[PDB]
Design a protein around this motif. Structure first.
Motif, PDB file in Angstrom:
ATOM      1  N   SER A 167       1.252  -1.177  -0.365  1.00  0.00           N
ATOM      2  CA  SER A 167       0.082   0.020   0.268  1.00  0.00           C
ATOM      3  C   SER A 167       0.984   1.605   0.211  1.00  0.00           C
ATOM      4  N   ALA A 168       1.716   1.317   0.990  1.00  0.00           N
ATOM      5  CA  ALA A 168       2.548   2.765   1.054  1.00  0.00           C
ATOM      6  C   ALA A 168       3.490   2.172  -0.596  1.00  0.00           C
ATOM      7  N   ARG A 169       4.083   1.580  -0.471  1.00  0.00           N
ATOM      8  CA  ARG A 169       4.945   1.388  -1.798  1.00  0.00           C
ATOM      9  C   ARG A 169       4.242   2.214  -2.676  1.00  0.00           C
ATOM     10  N   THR A 203       1.707   3.516  -3.014  1.00  0.00           N
ATOM     11  CA  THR A 203       1.880   5.307  -2.958  1.00  0.00           C
ATOM     12  C   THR A 203       2.663   6.382  -2.994  1.00  0.00           C
ATOM     13  N   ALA A 204       3.965   6.029  -3.149  1.00  0.00           N
ATOM     14  CA  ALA A 204       5.115   6.835  -2.701  1.00  0.00           C
ATOM     15  C   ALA A 204       5.319   6.462  -4.541  1.00  0.00           C
ATOM     16  N   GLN A 205       4.528   5.997  -5.205  1.00  0.00           N
ATOM     17  CA  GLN A 205       5.488   5.456  -6.539  1.00  0.00           C
ATOM     18  C   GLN A 205       4.162   7.044  -7.076  1.00  0.00           C
ATOM     19  N   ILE A 206       3.352   6.751  -6.595  1.00  0.00           N
ATOM     20  CA  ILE A 206       1.741   7.858  -7.039  1.00  0.00           C
ATOM     21  C   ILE A 206       2.145   9.139  -6.504  1.00  0.00           C
ATOM     22  N   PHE A 207       2.459   9.587  -5.237  1.00  0.00           N
ATOM     23  CA  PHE A 207       3.147  10.708  -4.962  1.00  0.00           C
ATOM     24  C   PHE A 207       4.506  11.072  -5.907  1.00  0.00           C
ATOM     25  N   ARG A 208       4.841  10.196  -6.394  1.00  0.00           N
ATOM     26  CA  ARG A 208       6.664  10.525  -6.758  1.00  0.00           C
ATOM     27  C   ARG A 208       5.643  11.245  -8.212  1.00  0.00           C
ATOM     28  N   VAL A 209       4.760  10.768  -9.237  1.00  0.00           N
ATOM     29  CA  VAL A 209       4.026  11.622 -10.371  1.00  0.00           C
ATOM     30  C   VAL A 209       3.807  13.232  -9.641  1.00  0.00           C
ATOM     31  N   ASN A 210       2.950  12.784  -8.636  1.00  0.00           N
ATOM     32  CA  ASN A 210       1.683  13.495  -8.273  1.00  0.00           C
ATOM     33  C   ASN A 210       2.790  15.341  -8.120  1.00  0.00           C
ATOM     34  N   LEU A 211       4.265  14.316  -7.017  1.00  0.00           N
ATOM     35  CA  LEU A 211       4.908  15.532  -7.054  1.00  0.00           C
ATOM     36  C   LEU A 211       5.015  16.440  -8.424  1.00  0.00           C
ATOM     37  N   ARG A 212       5.157  16.022  -9.873  1.00  0.00           N
ATOM     38  CA  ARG A 212       5.534  16.235 -11.298  1.00  0.00           C
ATOM     39  C   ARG A 212       4.571  17.352 -11.933  1.00  0.00           C
ATOM     40  N   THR A 213       2.603  16.391 -11.203  1.00  0.00           N
ATOM     41  CA  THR A 213       2.426  17.130 -12.223  1.00  0.00           C
ATOM     42  C   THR A 213       1.512  18.674 -11.271  1.00  0.00           C
ATOM     43  N   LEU A 214       2.024  18.545 -10.051  1.00  0.00           N
ATOM     44  CA  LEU A 214       1.867  19.830  -9.047  1.00  0.00           C
ATOM     45  C   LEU A 214       2.477  20.550  -9.255  1.00  0.00           C
ATOM     46  N   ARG A 215       3.561  20.375  -9.864  1.00  0.00           N
ATOM     47  CA  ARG A 215       4.797  21.572  -9.995  1.00  0.00           C
ATOM     48  C   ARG A 215       4.004  22.357 -11.374  1.00  0.00           C
ATOM     49  N   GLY A 216       3.588  21.207 -12.654  1.00  0.00           N
ATOM     50  CA  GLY A 216       2.960  21.858 -13.308  1.00  0.00           C
ATOM     51  C   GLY A 216       1.945  22.809 -13.694  1.00  0.00           C
ATOM     52  N   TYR A 217       0.812  22.488 -12.723  1.00  0.00           N
ATOM     53  CA  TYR A 217      -0.341  23.295 -12.132  1.00  0.00           C
ATOM     54  C   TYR A 217      -0.327  24.326 -11.583  1.00  0.00           C
ATOM     55  N   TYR A 218       0.776  24.390 -11.001  1.00  0.00           N
ATOM     56  CA  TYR A 218       1.662  25.855 -10.110  1.00  0.00           C
ATOM     57  C   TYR A 218       2.369  25.801 -11.029  1.00  0.00           C
ATOM     58  N   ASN A 219       3.043  26.078 -11.839  1.00  0.00           N
ATOM     59  CA  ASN A 219       4.028  26.684 -13.015  1.00  0.00           C
ATOM     60  C   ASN A 219       5.700  26.745 -12.483  1.00  0.00           C
ATOM     61  N   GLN A 220       5.939  25.326 -11.885  1.00  0.00           N
ATOM     62  CA  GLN A 220       6.678  25.171 -11.328  1.00  0.00           C
ATOM     63  C   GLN A 220       8.468  25.273 -11.136  1.00  0.00           C
ATOM     64  N   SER A 221       9.046  25.207 -10.892  1.00  0.00           N
ATOM     65  CA  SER A 221      10.166  24.038 -11.611  1.00  0.00           C
ATOM     66  C   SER A 221      11.164  23.320 -11.414  1.00  0.00           C
ATOM     67  N   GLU A 222      12.134  22.651 -11.458  1.00  0.00           N
ATOM     68  CA  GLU A 222      13.094  21.248 -10.615  1.00  0.00           C
ATOM     69  C   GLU A 222      13.952  21.969  -9.948  1.00  0.00           C
ATOM     70  N   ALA A 223      14.142  22.580 -10.010  1.00  0.00           N
ATOM     71  CA  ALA A 223      15.079  23.985  -9.028  1.00  0.00           C
ATOM     72  C   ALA A 223      14.486  23.851  -7.179  1.00  0.00           C
TER      73      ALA A 223
END
Lengths: 9, 100, 201, 272, 243
Positions: D65-67, D69-89
């Protein structure tokens, strides 16, 4: 137990 | 971005007794982001045996951790905990008071 | 785990058809796929909410308030609907991107034949040899043609062509052998054909 | 009233590597499990003694369950970056909390589930547990996506049935510890400021649960110092309440203590 | 799109094989299934953003991976006879899409595990001219094509009239015939019809050509035998009209 499914935001 | 400064508390597990072993706790809470530097000091010098808890958060999403060390108090020895966060200009240091 | 019913379906052209799907556990999303022989399954219908019914052309699927069943309906059957219909689902409580598949339902649509003028012809090869084929053609939809009763004899199942310009459809089976003991009249004997079947010389 | 609550945090780590996924499980005020991916051997582990003997089948499920979630959340973090027009920095934080509460009858009372991005509310499961609300206006895409795919139904089932079934399994597993009430060992202390002033401190120490109320009277609302409830480190909690008292006239100030483990609410005064 | 390489594959028992998949651009998930002779889509393994997500009873001898560029590899070795099937790759999980979990398949990898690579045979294509007894009765002319003695059934039949491919009047068999029915590794036969108007066949300026595209042995494959190497090749049979 934790939630088996989360969200793909 | 949400920037929240910690709420520091230096204390003991059991009431301090010169010679009787105890636990020195530095409880940091109400902070954001996760990233934090915490050190426990004995007469200015850093303690290396120091241990901590698992990063968790409250209903407001602010984090909370507990840095603890097994220690034996004397009246001669004085302890304090040094905390550093992004929200801090310079590390905030607070002294351990046995009556607080 | 899913269970598709019936396993196989033999429908006549124009007839409507229904297909069933059942889970052992409660499901939350249903997917209906068609698979043309040797090609990849292709998405037909997605169902997300209980009791929802969604259609895609003559195809119509239902969710099932039970959360354990889903149905697919083909409205007017055209012979091109031949293929496997796969049922897939999102089991309730399953982690993200977990989705089970069924073992499929085989659909067979029988084309309507307008003017059955039965006949058995002999075709010549482009090389001057005894080696040649027999052609059963222009027969109705009811002729359930059987396999080669011999070792050296070979018979194919009915195939339907459409000369869509002239708008004419016809059924046909090919028969061939190597023996001198190979004649048009002897070719289709096990296969029950009508009394009114044409045979030239 | 009991609660099975969980705290999930994922922090993106520019330069360092993969993000940090931490899961923290709680039965009432007791932490019983944890998963940390910063570790090389990442598995869901016991953090309470009544979990020390459980069996592989359980740990295996929970690590998965935890593993996942970590997999999805890792993607979610790069998705949320796009929504908020944020950088890899920059390093950003995704937090997910979920939990169920029992009623007085020991039957499901309420359930909650929320998401936050960079400490601010993001998406919330409605009180009905049947849809999602975009608390932030950037959460509008995540909100349509999750409502259209009927995600709430998965959570409604967890919060209403799984969470509750298990909360009881765990409550039984550690009956001796969890359900036992440790009442606060009280005492008042005197710390003189000047010749004129003096501070009277009321101490509530070694209490479980963490919920308590400490008050000073003559009602003396006007400037009383009250510190946050703190963990002792052994499972119990600590709290103190202070008041500025004029020298000599000490006994005029009374301390009122109210905790669950107490039959009678205790009232105190300083003894010289 | 979901691109899979190789489209076809013929190899010997004991040998290793590697199957590639390129997911839909943006899609983060890869699924491997295997569809046997009757059997449905039996699932093998699933990947998500480079990492393994689910395992569905792989043979241990079966191996897989997803690279940082979300491409995937399905390794199969040591190969056994029964592993002959269609291997499909499925793509999904693009967070950009509203319906993320919708699966997309590619036109699979047909794997033929054979004992002896000398059992491989290309087809013999032959076109048959219409019956003059059919032309008189129906006023239509059926051309018949046969692709015989081929192993395995890795073929594609296509008709070509006056240079360009035709589909109207065309009728290929959906399934091939076993020439030796009570035999394992029996060569196949395939029939296909092309019906034209009598007046179209009767014109000698009209060229009809049946064409069978056989998928055979690789160039790296060892051909010990004295007969021709049964490689991937187009085998045609033509005919011209006559009054």
């Amino acid at each position: 137990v934790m939630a088996p499914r989360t969200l793909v935001l | 971005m949400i920037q929240r400064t910690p709420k520091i508390q230096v204390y003991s597990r059991h009431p301090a007794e010169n010679g009787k072993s105890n636990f020195l706790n530095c409880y940091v809470s109400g902070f954001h982001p996760s990233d934090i530097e915490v050190d426990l000091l004995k007469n200015g010098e850093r303690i290396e045996k120091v241990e901590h808890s698992d990063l968790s958060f409250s209903k407001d999403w602010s984090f909370y951790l507990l840095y603890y060390t097994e220690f034996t108090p004397t009246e001669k020895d004085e302890y304090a905990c040094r905390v550093n966060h992004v929200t801090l200009s310079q590390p905030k240091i607070v002294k351990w008071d046995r009556d607080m | 785990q899913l269970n598709q019913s019936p396993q196989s379906m033999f429908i006549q052209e124009g007839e409507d058809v229904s297909m069933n799907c059942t889970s052992s556990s409660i499901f939350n999303t249903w997917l209906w796929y068609k698979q043309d022989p040797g090609e990849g399954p292709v998405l037909l219908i997605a169902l997300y909410k209980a009791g929802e019914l969604t259609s895609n052309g003559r195809l119509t699927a239902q969710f099932g308030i039970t959360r354990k069943d889903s149905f697919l309906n083909i409205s007017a059957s055209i012979p091109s609907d031949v293929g496997i219909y796969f049922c897939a689902g999102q089991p309730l409580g399953g982690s993200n991107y977990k989705l089970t598949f069924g073992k499929g339902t085989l659909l067979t649509v029988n084309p309507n034949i307008q003017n059955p003028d039965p006949a058995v012809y002999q075709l010549r090869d482009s090389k001057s040899s005894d080696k040649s084929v027999c052609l059963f053609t222009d027969f109705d939809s009811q002729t359930n043609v059987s396999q080669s009763k011999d070792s050296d004899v070979y018979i194919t199942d009915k195939c339907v062509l459409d000369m869509r310009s002239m708008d004419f459809k016809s059924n046909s089976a090919v028969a061939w052998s190597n023996k001198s003991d190979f004649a048009c009249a002897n070719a289709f004997n096990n296969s029950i054909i009508p009394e009114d079947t044409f045979f030239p010389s | 009233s009991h609660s099975l609550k969980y705290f999930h945090t994922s922090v993106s780590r520019p330069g360092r590597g993969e993000p940090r996924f931490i899961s923290v499980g709680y039965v009432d005020d007791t932490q019983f499990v944890r998963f940390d991916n910063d570790a090389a051997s990442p598995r869901m582990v016991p953090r309470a003694p009544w979990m020390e003997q459980e069996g592989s089948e359980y740990w295996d499920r929970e690590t998965r369950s935890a593993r996942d979630t970590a997999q999805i959340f890792r993607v979610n973090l790069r998705t949320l970056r796009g929504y908020y027009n944020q950088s890899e920095a920059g390093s950003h934080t995704l937090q997910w909390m979920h939990g169920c509460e029992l009623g007085p009858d020991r039957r499901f009372l309420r359930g909650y589930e929320q998401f936050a991005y960079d400490g601010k509310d993001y998406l919330t499961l409605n009180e009905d547990l049947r849809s999602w609300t975009a608390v932030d206006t950037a959460a509008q895409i995540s909100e349509q996506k999750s409502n259209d795919a009927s995600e709430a139904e998965h959570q409604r089932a967890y919060l209403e049935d799984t969470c509750v079934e298990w909360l009881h399994k765990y409550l039984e597993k550690g009956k001796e510890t969890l359900l036992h009430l440790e009442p606060p060992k009280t005492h008042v202390t005197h710390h003189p400021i000047s010749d004129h002033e003096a501070t009277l401190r009321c101490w509530a120490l070694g209490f479980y649960p963490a919920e308590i109320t400490l008050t000073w009277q003559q009602g003396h609302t006007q400037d009383t110092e009250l510190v946050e409830t703190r963990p002792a480190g052994d499972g119990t909690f600590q709290k103190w309440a202070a008041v500025v008292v004029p020298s000599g006239e000490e006994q005029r100030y009374t301390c009122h203590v109210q905790h669950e483990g107490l039959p009678e609410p205790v009232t105190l005064r300083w003894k010289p | 799109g979901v691109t899979q390489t190789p489209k076809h594959l013929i190899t010997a028992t004991g040998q290793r094989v590697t199957l590639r998949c390129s997911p839909r651009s943006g899609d983060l998930s890869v699924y491997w299934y295997q569809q046997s002779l009757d059997q449905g889509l039996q699932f093998l393994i699933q990947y998500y953003n480079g990492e393994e997500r689910a395992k569905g009873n792989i043979l241990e001898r079966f191996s897989a991976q997803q690279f940082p560029d979300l491409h995937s590899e399905l390794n199969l070795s040591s190969l056994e006879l029964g592993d002959s099937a269609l291997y499909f790759c499925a793509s999904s999980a693009n967070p950009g899409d509203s319906s993320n979990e919708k699966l997309f398949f590619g036109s699979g990898t047909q794997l033929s595990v054979l004992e002896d690579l000398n059992k491989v045979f290309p087809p013999e294509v032959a076109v048959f001219e219409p019956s003059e007894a059919e032309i008189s009765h129906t006023q239509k002319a059926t051309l018949v094509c046969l692709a015989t003695g081929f192993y395995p059934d890795h073929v594609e039949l296509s008709w070509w009239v006056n240079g360009k491919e035709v589909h109207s009047g065309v009728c290929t068999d959906p399934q091939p015939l076993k020439e030796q029915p009570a035999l394992n590794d029996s060569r196949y036969a395939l029939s296909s019809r092309l019906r034209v108007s009598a007046t179209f066949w009767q014109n000698p300026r009209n060229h009809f050509r049946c064409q069978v595209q056989f998928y055979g042995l690789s160039e790296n494959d060892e051909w010990t035998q004295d007969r021709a190497k049964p490689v991937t090749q187009i085998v045609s049979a033509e005919a011209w009209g006559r009054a």
